[PDB]
């Protein structure tokens, strides 16, 4: 097996399939995005960037809807990306579904880090920047959505990964053999072992300065599973208690029976 070539293949699949990556994000964050820091600038950004949405419910529920729309888009990109991981498409369709069901929000929050800095995050395909303080200012429970993801991102970004690392990390998130309900655990474990081996060797080559980077990222995978469990609980509270905050059907299917 050629593990350098496998790493390149997964990186190329990531560059093709994701509209946002860390290179693109950093170009934008380096200074154009419309800055959303208060209700006036939220409403202005909505009229330009999501006009049909405001052509109205509470601002918090509009933001929640925009968040979900981004997730739906990213799930679609993740499904196409997954098709490129060796062995993934040879799995039973039911196992492909299970792996994606549990893995997509761990991958979403990992990749979200690339558009975040300590002051805010890119939104709407890089055409908006919403401040972290504005999101904290929203009424409960909506102000509790993003802050844990910023906290994860600040530590994740301190690892100084590049897109070649992240592509492999996202592939390893998707190929977890301990998801509930898998049929062919043995084949998935071997697929995972192979991707994790590619990740290990890549980090050794690309980050010779950080000899613990691989176990740091194994821990981040475990942190992400916990972040997703907590996020799913918050989504359930919102769904149950906020009638205007409908869930998109693909996201309802993902969250249903997850944790």
């Amino acid at each position: 097996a050629d593990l350098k070539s496998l790493a390149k293949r997964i990186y190329e699949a990531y560059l093709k399939n994701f509209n946002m990556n860390k290179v693109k994000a950093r170009v934008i964050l380096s200074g154009p995005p419309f800055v959303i820091h208060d209700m006036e600038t939220l409403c202005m950004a909505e009229k330009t960037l999501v006009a049909k949405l405001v052509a109205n419910k509470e601002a918090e529920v509009r933001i929640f809807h925009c968040c979900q729309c981004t997730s739906v888009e990213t799930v679609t990109e993740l499904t196409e990306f997954a098709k490129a991981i060796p062995g993934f498409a040879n799995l039973d369709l039911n196992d492909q579904v299970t792996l994606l069901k549990y893995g997509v929000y761990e991958a979403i929050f990992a990749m979200l880090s690339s558009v975040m800095n300590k002051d805010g995050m890119l939104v709407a395909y890089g055409n908006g920047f919403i401040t972290r303080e504005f999101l904290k200012s929203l009424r409960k429970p909506f102000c509790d959505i993003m802050e844990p993801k910023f906290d994860f991102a600040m530590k994740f970004n301190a690892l100084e990964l590049d897109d070649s690392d992240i592509s492999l990390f996202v592939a390893a998130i998707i190929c977890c053999g301990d998801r509930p309900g898998l049929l062919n655990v043995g084949h998935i474990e071997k697929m995972q072992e192979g991707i994790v081996h590619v990740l290990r060797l890549h980090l050794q080559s690309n980050h010779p300065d950080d000899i613990f980077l691989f176990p740091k990222l194994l821990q981040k995978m475990a942190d992400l599973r916990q972040l997703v469990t907590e996020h799913a609980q918050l989504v359930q509270i919102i769904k149950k208690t906020e009638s205007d905050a409908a869930l998109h059907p693909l996201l309802q299917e993902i969250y249903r029976d997850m944790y």
Partner: peptide, 10 residues
């Protein structure tokens, strides 16, 4: 149980 995912995956 996941008709949209199933459809996206095909």
């Amino acid at each position: 149980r996941h008709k949209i995912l199933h459809r996206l995956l095909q």
